[PDB]
Write an enzyme that holds these catalytic residues in place. Structure first.
Site, mmCIF file in Angstrom:
data_model
loop_
_atom_site.group_PDB
_atom_site.id
_atom_site.type_symbol
_atom_site.label_atom_id
_atom_site.label_comp_id
_atom_site.label_asym_id
_atom_site.label_seq_id
_atom_site.Cartn_x
_atom_site.Cartn_y
_atom_site.Cartn_z
ATOM 1 N N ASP A 46 15.076 7.417 7.077
ATOM 2 C CA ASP A 46 14.179 7.639 8.219
ATOM 3 C C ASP A 46 14.244 6.500 9.214
ATOM 4 O O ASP A 46 13.602 6.549 10.246
ATOM 5 C CB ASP A 46 12.732 7.929 7.759
ATOM 6 C CG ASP A 46 11.847 8.412 8.863
ATOM 7 O OD1 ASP A 46 12.154 9.486 9.530
ATOM 8 O OD2 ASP A 46 10.787 7.823 9.090
ATOM 9 N N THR A 86 12.492 4.633 4.146
ATOM 10 C CA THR A 86 11.561 4.803 5.196
ATOM 11 C C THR A 86 10.965 3.438 5.624
ATOM 12 O O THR A 86 10.025 3.454 6.395
ATOM 13 C CB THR A 86 10.389 5.660 4.716
ATOM 14 O OG1 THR A 86 9.808 5.065 3.568
ATOM 15 C CG2 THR A 86 10.847 7.050 4.413
ATOM 16 N N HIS A 116 12.649 8.388 12.382
ATOM 17 C CA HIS A 116 11.425 7.651 12.254
ATOM 18 C C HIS A 116 10.228 8.518 12.342
ATOM 19 O O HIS A 116 9.270 8.245 13.100
ATOM 20 C CB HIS A 116 11.355 6.534 13.288
ATOM 21 C CG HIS A 116 10.905 5.223 12.711
ATOM 22 N ND1 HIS A 116 11.550 4.067 12.942
ATOM 23 C CD2 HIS A 116 9.849 4.921 11.856
ATOM 24 C CE1 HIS A 116 10.933 3.073 12.280
ATOM 25 N NE2 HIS A 116 9.890 3.599 11.616
ATOM 26 N N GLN A 117 10.258 9.577 11.556
ATOM 27 C CA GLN A 117 9.181 10.505 11.547
ATOM 28 C C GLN A 117 8.264 10.471 10.338
ATOM 29 O O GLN A 117 7.412 11.314 10.232
ATOM 30 C CB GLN A 117 9.662 11.925 11.886
ATOM 31 C CG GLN A 117 10.415 12.668 10.812
ATOM 32 C CD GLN A 117 10.873 14.069 11.197
ATOM 33 O OE1 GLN A 117 11.781 14.253 11.942
ATOM 34 N NE2 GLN A 117 10.275 15.039 10.607
ATOM 35 N N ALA A 118 8.409 9.467 9.472
ATOM 36 C CA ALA A 118 7.642 9.451 8.273
ATOM 37 C C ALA A 118 6.182 9.407 8.591
ATOM 38 O O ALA A 118 5.381 9.945 7.797
ATOM 39 C CB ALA A 118 8.041 8.288 7.399
ATOM 40 N N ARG A 174 12.586 -0.267 6.776
ATOM 41 C CA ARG A 174 13.234 -0.744 8.010
ATOM 42 C C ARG A 174 14.783 -0.612 7.881
ATOM 43 O O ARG A 174 15.374 -0.897 6.838
ATOM 44 C CB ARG A 174 12.890 -2.257 8.247
ATOM 45 C CG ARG A 174 11.390 -2.649 8.344
ATOM 46 C CD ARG A 174 10.715 -2.157 9.595
ATOM 47 N NE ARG A 174 11.447 -2.705 10.736
ATOM 48 C CZ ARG A 174 11.298 -3.969 11.171
ATOM 49 N NH1 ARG A 174 10.440 -4.785 10.565
ATOM 50 N NH2 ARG A 174 12.031 -4.427 12.166
ATOM 51 N N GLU A 231 18.617 1.826 15.399
ATOM 52 C CA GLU A 231 17.950 3.032 15.799
ATOM 53 C C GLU A 231 17.501 2.970 17.239
ATOM 54 O O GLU A 231 17.306 4.004 17.834
ATOM 55 C CB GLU A 231 16.761 3.329 14.846
ATOM 56 C CG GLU A 231 15.653 2.319 14.827
ATOM 57 C CD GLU A 231 14.612 2.716 13.776
ATOM 58 O OE1 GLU A 231 14.867 2.687 12.553
ATOM 59 O OE2 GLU A 231 13.513 3.108 14.175
ATOM 60 N N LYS A 253 0.827 -1.195 0.000
ATOM 61 C CA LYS A 253 0.000 0.000 0.000
ATOM 62 C C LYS A 253 0.897 1.296 0.000
ATOM 63 O O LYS A 253 0.606 2.254 -0.712
ATOM 64 C CB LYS A 253 -0.940 -0.023 1.227
ATOM 65 C CG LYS A 253 -1.673 1.289 1.483
ATOM 66 C CD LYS A 253 -2.952 1.385 0.638
ATOM 67 C CE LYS A 253 -3.989 2.303 1.299
ATOM 68 N NZ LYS A 253 -4.993 2.635 0.245
ATOM 69 N N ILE A 254 1.988 1.310 0.787
ATOM 70 C CA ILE A 254 2.873 2.443 0.792
ATOM 71 C C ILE A 254 3.583 2.625 -0.619
ATOM 72 O O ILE A 254 3.620 3.718 -1.168
ATOM 73 C CB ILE A 254 3.909 2.370 1.917
ATOM 74 C CG1 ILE A 254 3.234 2.494 3.344
ATOM 75 C CG2 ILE A 254 4.931 3.502 1.749
ATOM 76 C CD1 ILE A 254 4.171 2.093 4.483
#
Lengths: 333, 331, 331, 333
Positions: free
Chosen positions: D260, D234, D297-299, D236, D265, D155-156
Site C-alpha cells: 500500500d 502498509t 495508500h488507501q489503507a 512506509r 510513491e 497501536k496498528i
C-alpha cells in the site's frame, strides 16, 4: 487398411475442417480434445500418424511412447515446433509442420493493431467494462494524409499498403528487392531506411529476419524516427532490440507500439503464465507501459488461415504415405 | 475589459488548442475538468461565456443560475441536453457537433477489427501474463461483403477503406450518389439485400422516425448468422433489448457500439463506483463479443483542433456582433 | 495388475498430492486437465477408476460409455451432477465434498474485506497505471455488527475471526450451541433481529426447503441500507433476481458470491469466449459492487491435500473390499 | 464576522461530515467540487481559509493568487503535502495538515491485502468479470496454525496481531520497545529479526521509518526468509529496498507481496497515470508480476477515518483563528 490418424487438442472448428476437407483422402481420423503430453501419449496406440499442435508437450517420454507404439509421422498443424524434443526422435518417425502464410489475416491484423494503439481501443474496453465511460487520455490521431513507412514489400506488405492507401495515407517503403511496377500500381514510393525513419508517422515491420534486419530497430534507428511514431511488428521478434525499445518508450520517442511477435516469445507465447513469474525483465517492463500492446502471435488466427492449415496438414500426411519428399519436414539434426 | 470564458469537461489538448487558436483576441480563459451541473453552475459567476460538453446536466436550475449570473453565451462542444425552453432568451446557446469524418470512419474500422480479431480480449489476457490465444480466432475481411448503411461523407471514407481490404461493398442510402458508387466501386441496394448479404454491417446514417430502431428483432432475423455489427452513428438506430436477444441467439457474431440509446445517462463519465441502473446496458457489458466505447469515434487531435476552432469562431463572432453559425435558435 | 486411475479436471497440486499420497499402492495414474463429458468419456477405455470434478457433465451418454468401457468406480472430487439413476449399478459412485472449514471461513473474511475496501477495483486501476483512489472508501469493521447465518464449524471459525476485529457478532442457527456462544462471545438471535441489526451478513448454512431463497426481496427489505452480504454456502440461499433489484435500490451496499444458484452451468470453466445465456448472472457481473468467484473458498493447499487423501482412501477401500465411506448409494 | 472557509475537491460525504461536525463551530463554509489549481485559485477571493486535498496542484501561481486574495490559512485534509510548493508561501499564510492515524482502518486493510494476495481474489475478479470461471492457479494457503511475523507492535500492530490471533495463527513480533504485558494479553512472542525472518509464513511491516528500518527488507534479509513467504507493507515505502524485492520475486523467495506504500510513491500515488509512461523501472516491473498487489495508500480510506480527518480539520482551523499553536503545521523552511 486406411491410414489411421489421431489428432490432439481439437476444437470443434478443427474437427469440421478435417472432416470436410479430408472427405477426399481415405484416412481414418480420430479427434481428441486432450493435448499430447506424456499423460496422453499412450493413446497413440494403434495409430500410424499423430497430429499435434502448439499446446502439446512433446518431450522425450512422449516421443519414446509414440515410437514404441509405432507412430511413423508427427504432423504439427502449426508453424512452430519448439514444443518438440527433436533431438530425442532419432528418426523413429518423421516430423512435419505447416509454414505460416495467410497474408490477408496478417496484414488485416496489423491494421487492427495500429488502430487499437492509435485510438486506445483496448484501454477504452477495460474502462467501459468497469463502468468508466470517461474518455480522458484516449485521444488519437487521424491516419488520413499521414505517412506510413512499410519495411518489406512482399505479399503481406503489399496487402497492407493497399489498405493504408485506402485510408489516403501517403505510403513510403523500404525493401532490398523493390518492385517499381507494384509501387506504380499501389501508389507508394520506395525510399531508404533513413528517409523512412525521418518521414514516417507510422512504421510497420513486414520483412524477413536476416543478419541485416536483426535488431534493425534499435537505439540508433529509433533516434531517427519522429517523436510520437506508432510502431507495429507482426513480422519477427528479433527485428526489434527490445531493450532499446523500452528506453525509446521512456524517452517518448515511440508514441505507441503493438507487438504480435517478441524476440524471446518461445518462452511465453501460446501459454498462460498468468499465475507465475515472468522472468524476462524486458517483457515484464513492456507489459506495464500504457502504450504497448502485445499479443501472442495471433495475426494469422482466422478461420481461413485455419482451414488452409488443415489442408496443408492433410497434404503433408498424404505426401508422407505416398513416399514423396516432405517439403514441410522439421529436420531433427 | 477582457472577454471571460469558463470551460467545463476539459480533456486532451482542449487547453492547448483553445489557448493557441484563441490568442490575439483578448480572451481570458479558465479551464476545468469537472462537468457543469447545478452543483457547479455557481462557478460561472463573473463569466461572459460558458463552454460545456455533451454530458453536462444543463437543467432548469443550472440555467437559472447561469442567467442570474448574467452569462451571455453557452457554447456546447460536441453536443446534440440543454433544456432549451427554460433559457427563455436569457442567453444564447451554441451547439458544435463532433462531426469529424476521417476520425470516425477510421475508428469504425478499428472497432470492426478489434471485435473480429478480439484484440481487446487479447490485451486483457497478455497484460495478466496469459499468452493463450484460445477462442480468439476471427475471420478475414478480404472478399467478404460489407453493408454500409448511410453514404454520407463518413460512409464514403469507410467504404473507400474497406475497398482497400478488397471487401465487396454494398450500401443503402435514400439519396444515393451513383457517381461515388462508380468511383469507389460499391453497389447501392435495398435494406433487405444488405441484411441478407452482409458479413459486416456498419450504421452511418441519421436518426429519423424511420431509422429509429431500424436494427431490431425483425431486421436482425434477416441478417447472416455470425454477422459483425458496428454503430458509430446514433444509439437509437438499434433496439438494444432486441440486440441482447440476438446476441443470445447467436445471430450477431460480434458488436461494437460507440453510441447507445441511452448514453446520455452514462457516457463521458466515470460510473465505475456506482450502480448502473440501466439493465440493458449492464447486460451488454457482460457479453464477450460486445465492445462499447464512449462516443469517442471523433476523438483525434485533428478533430479536436477543428472543433476547437469552430467553437472559438462562434465566440469571436459573438463578441464582434456577427451571426453565430452554430447558434441554436429559440422561440 | 496395477489399478488404473484416470483423473479429469486436474488443477493445482492434484498431480503431486495424488502421486505422493498414492505411493506404495500399485496405482497407475493418468492426469488430464480437460473435463469429463460425452466428448471425452471415451478416454476412460481401459481404466478401472475415473476421478472427476464438480463441473463434469456426467449425463446418460457419458455414463453409458464408461459402463461400456467397464469402469468400476467413479469418484467425484468436490462435487454435490451425476445422473445417478442412469448408472443402474453398473459401477459405483463416490462423492467427496470440498468441506474445508478453515479455508472457507478465511476466504469469507477475504471476500468481505475485498468488497468493503474495494481491493479488486484498486487492483484493476493500479495495474493500468491509475493510482487514483476516488470512490474507494470503505468502512471500519471494528464495533460493527456481523450477522452469521449458520453456526457449524465454518461459521464458528468465522465468528472467532470477526471477534478478533472486535466486531459485535450475532448469529442464527436452528441448533444453537450456547457453550460456543459463551466461549466465542456472540449472541444467538432470530433472523428478523439479524437482518435489522447487521452491518455485515454471511451465509454459512445448509440448503433446505426453508433456507432456499431465504435472502429475497422481503428479507433484504429488513436489512440495513449499505449492508455487506457474503455467500460462500450455497447459491440457492439467495433469490438472485431479487438481489439484482436490491442492488439497484441500493439496499445492498456490496455483495461477494462464491456460489450462485445456477453455477452448475458456469463454474470452474472458462466461458470468456462464449455468450453467457443467464441474464441474471450477466447482470450481476456488471455491478461495481458485486464480486463473484468460482466456488473457490475451499481452494487451499491444505484443503486439497485432505480432499486428495479422502479420495485416495475411498479408492483404496474399494480395491481392498471395504466400505467406501463416500459412496453415493443407489436403488 | 464568522470565519469564511472555501473547500476544494469536496465529495458528498465530505460535505455531510463538515456540516454535521461543523455545526458547533461558527464558520461559514462553501464547498466546491473543483480542485484547487491555478485555474481555480481566484475563487479564493473573499475567504479567510482554504481547505485543500491530495489532488490539488498548489504551485507558485496558485499560492501567489491566494496570498493576494488575503488567505491566512491553508488546511490540507490529508497527511501529505507534496502537492504544495512550500518554498513559495513565504509566510503569507500558514499551512496545516492532518496526520495519519486511523489504526483500525489500516490493520483491517492489511489483513484484506494478505488474504487478497494469498487467495488470489483480485485475479479471480479479473477472470470472472471476463466470463472465465476457471480456478486453475488460484490456490492459496490456510492461515490457521501458520506463523505471522509482525514488525512493529504499536497501536496498528496490536490490532493486527489480535485479528491474526483470531485466525489461530501463531504470532511472533519484533519491536525495539517491546511490551511484555501486551504480548501476554494478545498471546504473541517477541523475537529477534533473524528469528522472525526464519520462522514466518507471513510478514507485515508496521513500524516507523528511521535510519535503522530504512530498507530493512532487502536482499540480505529476504535471503533469510522462508521460500513462499507472503509480505505486506502498509507502513512506509522506504522500509523495503524495492529493487531487491524484484530480484526476490524472480528467485521465488517471496511468494506474494502486497504494497500500500512505495518508496517513490510521491511521483505516482493518488494520480491517474494510466495514459502516460511510468518512468520508474522498478514500479513498472513490480506491476507486471502476478503475485504483486499495489494499492495507492488507501489503507486509511474508511468513512470513520474520513470523519476524524474532518474533525481534525475543523480543530485545525479553530486553533488557528484562536491563535493557538498549530500542532499540525507544515513548516515552510
Amino acid at each position: 487398411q486406411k491410414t489411421k490418424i489421431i489428432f490432439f487438442d481439437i476444437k470443434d472448428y478443427d474437427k469440421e475442417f478435417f472432416k470436410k476437407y479430408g472427405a477426399d483422402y481415405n484416412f481414418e481420423m480420430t479427434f481428441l480434445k486432450v493435448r499430447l503430453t506424456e499423460e496422453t501419449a499412450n493413446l497413440t496406440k494403434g495409430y500410424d500418424v499423430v497430429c499435434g499442435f502448439a499446446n502439446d508437450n512433446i518431450n522425450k517420454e512422449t516421443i519414446d511412447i509414440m515410437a514404441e507404439n509405432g507412430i511413423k509421422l508427427l504432423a504439427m498443424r502449426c508453424a512452430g515446433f519448439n514444443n518438440v524434443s527433436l533431438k530425442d526422435v532419432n528418426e523413429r518417425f518423421k516430423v512435419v509442420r505447416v509454414p505460416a502464410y495467410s497474408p490477408h489475416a496478417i496484414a488485416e491484423y496489423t491494421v487492427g493493431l495500429i488502430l487499437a494503439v492509435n485510438r486506445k481501443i483496448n484501454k477504452a474496453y477495460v474502462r467501459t467494462r468497469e463502468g468508466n465511460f470517461s474518455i480522458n487520455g484516449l485521444m488519437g490521431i487521424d491516419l488520413y494524409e499521414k505517412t506510413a513507412g512499410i519495411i518489406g514489400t512482399g505479399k503481406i506488405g503489399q496487402i497492407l499498403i493497399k489498405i493504408l492507401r485506402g485510408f489516403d495515407m501517403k505510403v513510403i517503403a523500404y525493401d532490398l528487392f523493390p518492385n517499381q511496377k507494384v509501387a506504380d500500381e499501389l501508389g507508394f514510393e520506395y525510399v531508404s531506411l533513413d528517409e523512412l525513419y525521418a518521414n514516417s508517422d507510422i512504421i510497420s515491420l513486414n520483412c524477413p529476419l536476416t543478419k541485416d534486419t536483426k535488431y534493425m530497430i534499435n537505439r540508433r534507428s529509433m533516434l531517427k524516427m519522429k517523436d510520437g511514431v506508432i510502431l507495429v511488428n507482426t513480422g519477427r521478434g528479433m527485428l526489434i532490440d527490445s531493450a532499446d525499445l523500452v528506453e525509446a518508450l521512456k524517452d517518448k520517442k515511440i508514441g505507441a507500439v503493438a507487438l504480435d511477435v517478441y524476440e524471446e516469445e518461445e518462452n511465453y507465447f501460446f501459454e498462460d503464465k498468468s499465475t507465475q513469474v515472468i522472468e524476462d525483465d524486458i517483457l515484464g517492463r513492456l507489459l506495464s507501459f500504457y502504450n504497448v500492446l502485445i499479443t501472442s502471435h495471433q495475426a494469422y488466427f482466422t478461420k481461413e488461415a485455419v482451414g488452409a492449415i488443415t489442408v496443408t496438414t492433410l497434404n503433408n500426411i498424404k505426401d508422407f504415405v505416398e513416399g514423396r519428399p516432405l517439403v514441410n519436414e522439421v529436420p531433427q539434426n
